[PDB]
Amino acid sequence: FGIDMNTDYTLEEVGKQFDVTRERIRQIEAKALRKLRHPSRSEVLRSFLDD
């Protein structure tokens, strides 16, 4: 997502760095997206949906 960097890196761009695996990195992404959606760390983040 390009946090704290001049640009974001696409799936190909991040593949050449760690692993050329597409589905693997995509499912680690989905892992993070659920882990953020749990109502144990999402309580504060839920207050920003109004904006």
Binding site: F1, G2, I3, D8, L33, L36, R37, S42, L45, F48, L49, D50
Partner: protein, 100 residues
Amino acid sequence: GPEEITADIPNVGEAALSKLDESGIVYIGAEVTGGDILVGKVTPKGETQLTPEEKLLRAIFGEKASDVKDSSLRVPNGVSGTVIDVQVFTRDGVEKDKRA
């Protein structure tokens, strides 16, 4: 895009829309306090830049903001009264709403 007057307004609770009819105009005689929505106006929203954090939030929650911008008329703060009359003028050629 042309602006539209409607009761369909993004990210607004139905409580604020209770005093609007299906056409988006407050009923005559409705007591209204400061900050309420007298008439719901929607303007088309231009392309918006998405920063990394807000797009992360969009990915997390999945909601998408459509081509809509809230520019409805609100009662100025600290003013409370009752709507005694509403008047609608419309251009010739454009179709009139059921309230009109």
